Design an enzyme around this catalytic site. Structure first.
Site, PDB file in Angstrom:
ATOM      1  NE  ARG A 106     -16.951  10.991 -16.628  1.00  0.00           N
ATOM      2  CZ  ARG A 106     -16.299  10.407 -15.469  1.00  0.00           C
ATOM      3  NH1 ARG A 106     -16.901   9.684 -14.768  1.00  0.00           N
ATOM      4  NH2 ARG A 106     -15.094  10.993 -15.174  1.00  0.00           N
ATOM      5  CG  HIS A 117     -15.471  10.528 -20.363  1.00  0.00           C
ATOM      6  ND1 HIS A 117     -15.085   9.376 -19.781  1.00  0.00           N
ATOM      7  CD2 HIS A 117     -14.004  11.166 -20.679  1.00  0.00           C
ATOM      8  CE1 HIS A 117     -13.748   9.176 -19.773  1.00  0.00           C
ATOM      9  NE2 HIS A 117     -13.353  10.139 -20.143  1.00  0.00           N
ATOM     10  NE  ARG A 144      -4.011   0.108   2.146  1.00  0.00           N
ATOM     11  CZ  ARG A 144      -5.097   0.231   1.256  1.00  0.00           C
ATOM     12  NH1 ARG A 144      -5.405   1.241   0.920  1.00  0.00           N
ATOM     13  NH2 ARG A 144      -5.974  -0.767   0.969  1.00  0.00           N
ATOM     14  CB  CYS A 158      -8.240  10.130 -21.310  1.00  0.00           C
ATOM     15  SG  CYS A 158      -9.601  10.374 -20.033  1.00  0.00           S
TER      16      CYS A 158
HETATM   17  N1  LIG Z   1     -10.684   6.488 -18.687  1.00  0.00           N
HETATM   18  C1  LIG Z   1      -9.908   6.173 -18.022  1.00  0.00           C
HETATM   19  O1  LIG Z   1      -9.785   5.087 -17.271  1.00  0.00           O
HETATM   20  C2  LIG Z   1      -8.659   6.786 -17.573  1.00  0.00           C
HETATM   21  C3  LIG Z   1      -8.111   7.551 -18.863  1.00  0.00           C
HETATM   22  C4  LIG Z   1      -6.963   8.545 -18.441  1.00  0.00           C
HETATM   23  C5  LIG Z   1      -6.239   8.636 -17.458  1.00  0.00           C
HETATM   24  N2  LIG Z   1      -6.968   7.930 -16.234  1.00  0.00           N
HETATM   25  C6  LIG Z   1      -6.264   7.943 -14.895  1.00  0.00           C
HETATM   26  O2  LIG Z   1      -5.366   6.906 -14.629  1.00  0.00           O
HETATM   27  C7  LIG Z   1      -5.330   6.511 -13.520  1.00  0.00           C
HETATM   28  C8  LIG Z   1      -5.631   4.927 -13.414  1.00  0.00           C
HETATM   29  O3  LIG Z   1      -7.019   4.878 -12.840  1.00  0.00           O
HETATM   30  P1  LIG Z   1      -7.760   3.284 -13.399  1.00  0.00           P
HETATM   31  O4  LIG Z   1      -8.870   3.865 -14.244  1.00  0.00           O
HETATM   32  O5  LIG Z   1      -6.762   2.437 -13.994  1.00  0.00           O
HETATM   33  O6  LIG Z   1      -8.232   2.996 -12.237  1.00  0.00           O
HETATM   34  P2  LIG Z   1      -9.038   1.640 -11.572  1.00  0.00           P
HETATM   35  O7  LIG Z   1      -9.644   1.551 -10.274  1.00  0.00           O
HETATM   36  O8  LIG Z   1      -9.894   0.931 -12.784  1.00  0.00           O
HETATM   37  O9  LIG Z   1      -7.639   0.551 -11.403  1.00  0.00           O
HETATM   38  C9  LIG Z   1      -6.671   1.197 -10.638  1.00  0.00           C
HETATM   39  C10 LIG Z   1      -5.953   0.105  -9.735  1.00  0.00           C
HETATM   40  O10 LIG Z   1      -5.272   0.480  -8.689  1.00  0.00           O
HETATM   41  C11 LIG Z   1      -5.137  -0.228  -7.534  1.00  0.00           C
HETATM   42  N3  LIG Z   1      -4.852   0.435  -6.289  1.00  0.00           N
HETATM   43  C12 LIG Z   1      -5.343   1.598  -5.557  1.00  0.00           C
HETATM   44  N4  LIG Z   1      -4.618   1.810  -4.691  1.00  0.00           N
HETATM   45  C13 LIG Z   1      -3.367   1.220  -4.889  1.00  0.00           C
HETATM   46  C14 LIG Z   1      -2.311   1.546  -4.101  1.00  0.00           C
HETATM   47  N5  LIG Z   1      -2.190   2.340  -2.937  1.00  0.00           N
HETATM   48  N6  LIG Z   1      -1.247   0.833  -4.565  1.00  0.00           N
HETATM   49  C15 LIG Z   1      -1.543  -0.136  -5.399  1.00  0.00           C
HETATM   50  N7  LIG Z   1      -2.347  -0.359  -6.207  1.00  0.00           N
HETATM   51  C16 LIG Z   1      -3.521   0.466  -5.824  1.00  0.00           C
HETATM   52  C17 LIG Z   1      -6.432  -0.733  -7.588  1.00  0.00           C
HETATM   53  O11 LIG Z   1      -6.537  -1.848  -6.892  1.00  0.00           O
HETATM   54  C18 LIG Z   1      -6.878  -0.942  -8.844  1.00  0.00           C
HETATM   55  O12 LIG Z   1      -7.012  -2.297  -9.307  1.00  0.00           O
HETATM   56  C19 LIG Z   1      -6.207   7.514 -12.568  1.00  0.00           C
HETATM   57  O13 LIG Z   1      -5.577   8.527 -12.093  1.00  0.00           O
HETATM   58  C20 LIG Z   1      -7.279   7.907 -13.789  1.00  0.00           C
HETATM   59  O14 LIG Z   1      -7.869   9.041 -13.412  1.00  0.00           O
HETATM   60  C21 LIG Z   1      -7.934   7.221 -16.118  1.00  0.00           C
END
Ligand SMILES: NC(=O)c1ccc[n+]([C@@H]2O[C@H](COP(=O)([O-])OP(=O)(O)OC[C@H]3O[C@@H](n4cnc5c(N)ncnc54)[C@H](O)[C@@H]3O)[C@@H](O)[C@H]2O)c1
Ligand SMILES: NC(=O)c1ccc[n+]([C@@H]2O[C@H](COP(=O)([O-])OP(=O)(O)OC[C@H]3O[C@@H](n4cnc5c(N)ncnc54)[C@H](O)[C@@H]3O)[C@@H](O)[C@H]2O)c1
Ligand SMILES: NC(=O)c1ccc[n+]([C@@H]2O[C@H](COP(=O)([O-])OP(=O)(O)OC[C@H]3O[C@@H](n4cnc5c(N)ncnc54)[C@H](O)[C@@H]3O)[C@@H](O)[C@H]2O)c1
Ligand SMILES: NC(=O)c1ccc[n+]([C@@H]2O[C@H](COP(=O)([O-])OP(=O)(O)OC[C@H]3O[C@@H](n4cnc5c(N)ncnc54)[C@H](O)[C@@H]3O)[C@@H](O)[C@H]2O)c1
Lengths: 334, 335, 335, 334
Positions: free
Chosen positions: A233, A179, A78, A152
């Site tokens: 959304r 979105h 974590r 994104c």
């Molecule tokens: N449309 C999109 O999904 C999108 C597009 C561009 C950017 N982002 C950004 O990219 C990032 C990734 O988000 P995501 O959509 O993959 O989220 P998600 O929740 O689908 O996946 C993120 C993962 O991180 C893990 N996690 C959480 N806290 C943690 C910690 N302390 N240590 C280790 N693992 C941990 C969770 O278990 C989860 O599986 C975010 O900042 C989001 O805003 C998302």
């Protein structure tokens, strides 16, 4: 081959891993870190509600996951202080957990033995922020160690605005991104910090805020103060559309707008931005590798007010942008 | 009791029927026509996937349907020439098949016995066009006989534009409406005149043209050649949002923009245009009787570029306007 | 290179076309017919809301379409009499309009120049009916000329039933298939022959009849009068599940039931029937080439009552079976 | 008028509150307890993605919510030891948080001053379990203090099986519930204890387990060992269908099956179980007050194997069952 680690094996972590397999010849993911057990993690890598079944075999044991016979070491700390990347000789960490977008939290990975960190989101106190194909040539191998790939939505809109400001001049622009829902929304009506993201996502249009427009200024300083916007959304699981309406002092036509985009969207840049005269819907840009797919057919002009529209796969396209960026950092000193 | 008939008992048809039972003390539908049998019609009337089960009881026979014990005649006539409104002493016809939008075809209903015809859509060659609350005072009981209620989108946009033009002066506006999918779209990828409405409606953002932005001139002439736009059809079954982004020469703020609407969103006009600061999402405006609900929280300003956003239940919101209008027609000369 | 034509280039049509490019080294579609123009056809072929963008390049002109540089003739002929397969030396026709399920109509294609016709649906008056992997060895190159590939549901159920009947003996079975919605359903509440398929497909569980349970006798006679069922159409665009619940006189356990399938799910048959212990959900079987993927984790026993569950991509899974069958027909006498 | 408290103001808490307003003359909710602030709670009460806008006015302050001018006191104690119901003179608590289905945890509310607890779910160590209209006449005012309303699915299937076993005899029965997704599922592919409930709920059919069938035995002891089943979660936001396939020694017809249900589904019981010969889909049973709506048209008979099908609104119908039950407890000594 530069070795890579991922902190945070979620939607974006997993898209990135897939993109490396599918799109890269000089990158290798050799360790990840996440909260959950390897059975759950390997299952999520294998099957995917959007992207399909993975081409390769997936096995796991109590401290690794093995993909097409290549052992990836997995942790679950974590706190990224508790990791060691130099162990695995990792040169670049992708910080994609979403809970270390503060660059001063993120530099821990450097502490823990990495040489470069890339944040897959808007960051704070970052050494620099990038939308590949817009401001990537300002990357400074010496001093850009903890860096941000932006959002994104920013990666959709910045390429298109660079082009449009350069040729016409944008006085002011307001955006709406329509979105795909994201996983920080509720499936049933439940509490959220944000009273709208609290509502059932698959049966609603949910207005929400985004910094994506103000953030353009980080990659196009000349546009500071000049853009704002927000998101609707809507119930598709991926695929989005940035709709920008702006003022130009110029006197412009649908045809001159479109010709500028087309003119620009060539060579390497055209891998970030595409030009399309096709009858697209969201499902058509799923798994599309451009950050911005410009829809010539949607250009509207009324007086000195313009509306243009660009598509993006807010998972995959963004990822591919991030991959380009990682490849760049990987090609220079490090 | 002004008597009413309905040509085309589909979505809007049936919304209308219910709107009358819920919201009017002086109207009665006494006959309707469509393309189907009374078993199929009685079913679709009784069970609605959006509006729920109907309160009243429903019986049918071979030439009618009865609803809370009131007999309603039913015909299955592809061609309105073959219809006899006068047989039931119908004054006003709601033409809602979406196949008779040319007033020159729709005036058939007059010949067939009707005194007025209200087309529930943008029309061509009509006597007149109305967004209730906006330009309904220019209704001419003598000369306005075949009239348009305009589109759902135009019913949303006009109330809002009037107010903001009146206060600040619109140079040009460009609109995007994020709109629930509609019957004319395909469930699966399949041929269609429009190559995008041809794609699977419930898993796609689908851009398509609408003239609801140009159509505003018809009800507010001072805006001719000043507004345009398009729609993104998305996967909800009802509920839409109209996003407008305009220039003004006035100097404006979020607060003053919003203050204009709230000032005007009162009295009778407030029954067409609503003002909200609630945290709305689309399901919150389903079965809302306003033509335009303004989302004060969505308002944005950058220089002289302004963005505003208004909600509308494209089925029920639109239908409540169409009823207001039908109520006006009926409060006056029926010759 | 056996040459192939397609009548009805809709969902299954186009799935088939792609299946040929992805999965066959000895077949070529050289002509297709539908009800539309080549702009609309080239579009629907290039962009698919389920299968994604097509790999190859696509051009059209006024009488054809070209795909990776291979010219494909296109006709727009409501009536197959007016078609000339022989003009292009087509042997095998895929009849996939879903309007020529009577073999007596579909034998028109023979007259129109074709030697064989494969109906991608339950048919009536056909020479024969095939679930590949089940009863495809009884194919008669001389007498079997107009043949059925049966339904998607029957392609899912049969592999599974054969195995379990062979091992344990089915008394009676009752099936429920939870099935992705299909083109014949309505997007909005609107008239339809079936009063339930008439209701909004993407926000409803919609029960409807299917004869895929009775249709199993055609391919496994020993089960005649022994199976029945129905379907619940639900809001996904593809992916379905076949739920069967039967009696046996044998004494059975979860483990032995599952052991039967795993034993048999091997070799060529294993390409029709698959065995899985993975934690599957419907999106995991989209673009899966098996006719029946058996979910070992879903199996239940109570007394002599057994429940089993098998997955199928009703579009692509079904189409891969239809191709196996088309490959068989083509490996033999074409006279 | 018996006063009532709710612990847990979620989907089921809020449905219950609405049901009291709409359907009751001798019950009054006067306090609730939840994690979240009153602004969020009042907003969720006001607007609802399924049920619509509430008829009444809703105001809130720092320690209450006021509905149609009637002050409801609100708390936020993660631990029900920390509450006082006798303060507000509450006679019945509905435990609907889902994190106190153990009756020995739940009896705390009695500690904290209530006289009866009703658990809105399968319970453990409960004084008794009830499907109103099936085994409600065994309620014992003296000794049934902490009681369970069973599950939605159980409340659908038990009424129908009582009838069918009574007339035909059920040797063995296996069920599939085709079920609206619930809020314990993931909107995007994310980790869950259950590897299938982990998958995007609005684009999947998700098989999952349910005790609903074994639990029938609690209300129909004669059926122990004789029923099992499972669920297919499907993308509708509410409304479900229980599909039971069973063996009878009897020799039965579609017509005799249907006639038994029809025969039975009258008077008071017919308020729990309905008989329908109509062309229903899920949206038709949204907001339907019966626990089980029996679909005569779906009855299939093959040899000595029968399939019958009953609908339920897994929110509202279940709630209404629970309300009947509460009304009963409220009508007797207490
Ligand atoms: N449309 C999109 O999904 C999108 C597009 C561009 C950017 N982002 C950004 O990219 C990032 C990734 O988000 P995501 O959509 O993959 O989220 P998600 O929740 O689908 O996946 C993120 C993962 O991180 C893990 N996690 C959480 N806290 C943690 C910690 N302390 N240590 C280790 N693992 C941990 C969770 O278990 C989860 O599986 C975010 O900042 C989001 O805003 C998302
Ligand atoms: N969101 C909305 O649905 C919306 C809002 C505003 C305006 N409108 C307009 O209202 C019109 C009706 O729309 P709808 O959504 O009810 O569509 P619909 O298909 O639900 O309604 C049409 C009904 O009329 C019947 N019909 C068709 N052709 C006919 C004919 N020639 N004679 C008699 N009956 C015939 C159909 O069978 C059907 O029952 C359209 O022009 C539409 O653009 C719709
Ligand atoms: N899940 C499935 O989709 C599935 C699975 C198994 C079998 N099938 C069966 O396959 C058949 C085709 O199904 P589909 O899903 O492709 O439907 P579809 O509507 O997608 O395909 C039909 C296509 O043929 C065209 N067509 C219609 N009538 C025609 C005619 N008279 N002459 C020429 N072309 C005509 C249509 O315009 C359309 O493009 C149906 O009988 C269906 O039951 C479908
Ligand atoms: N289909 C259905 O929704 C359905 C049907 C029948 C029974 N049930 C059962 O009824 C119960 C209610 O679940 P739900 O669907 O309302 O869930 P939910 O998550 O939608 O709402 C429950 C609420 O409880 C609150 N909560 C959680 N822990 C709490 C605590 N310690 N103290 C106070 N409040 C707390 C949450 O904030 C949430 O708002 C569950 O046991 C469920 O299994 C649900």
């Amino acid at each position: 081959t530069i070795r890579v680690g991922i902190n945070g094996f979620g939607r974006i972590g997993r898209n990135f891993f897939r993109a490396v397999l599918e799109r890269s010849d000089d990158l290798e993911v050799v360790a990840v870190n996440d909260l959950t057990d390897n059975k759950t993690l390997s299952t999520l890598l294998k099957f995917d509600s959007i992207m399909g079944r993975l081409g390769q075999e997936v096995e796991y044991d109590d401290d690794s996951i093995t993909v097409g016979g290549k052992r990836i070491a997995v942790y679950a700390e974590r706190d990224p202080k508790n990791l060691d990347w130099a162990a695995h000789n990792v040169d670049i960490v992708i910080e994609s957990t979403g809970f270390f977008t503060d660059a001063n939290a993120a530099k821990a990975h450097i502490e823990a033995g990495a040489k470069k960190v890339i944040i897959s989101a808007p960051a704070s106190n970052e050494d620099a922020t990038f939308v590949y194909g817009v401001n990537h040539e300002s990357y400074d191998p010496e001093n850009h160690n903890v860096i941000s790939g932006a959002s994104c939505t920013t990666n959709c809109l910045a390429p298109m605005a660079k082009v449009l400001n350069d040729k016409f001049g944008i006085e002011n622009g307001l955006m709406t991104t329509v979105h795909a829902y994201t996983g920080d929304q509720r499936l049933h009506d439940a509490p959220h910090r944000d009273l709208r993201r609290a509502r059932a996502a698959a049966v609603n249009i949910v207005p929400t805020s985004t910094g994506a427009a103000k953030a353009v200024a980080l990659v196009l300083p000349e546009l500071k103060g000049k853009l704002d916007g927000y998101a609707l959304r809507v119930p598709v699981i991926t695929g989005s559309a940035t709709d920008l309406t702006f003022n130009t002092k110029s006197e412009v036509t649908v045809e001159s707008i479109n010709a500028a985009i087309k003119e620009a969207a060539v060579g390497e840049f055209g891998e970030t931005l595409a030009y399309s005269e096709e009858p697209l819907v969201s499902t058509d840009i799923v798994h599309d590798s451009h950050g911005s797919i410009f829809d010539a057919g949607l250009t509207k002009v009324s007086g000195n007010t313009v509306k243009v529209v660009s598509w993006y796969d807010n998972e995959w396209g963004y990822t591919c942008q991030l991959l380009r960026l990682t490849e760049l950092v990987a090609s220079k000193l490090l």
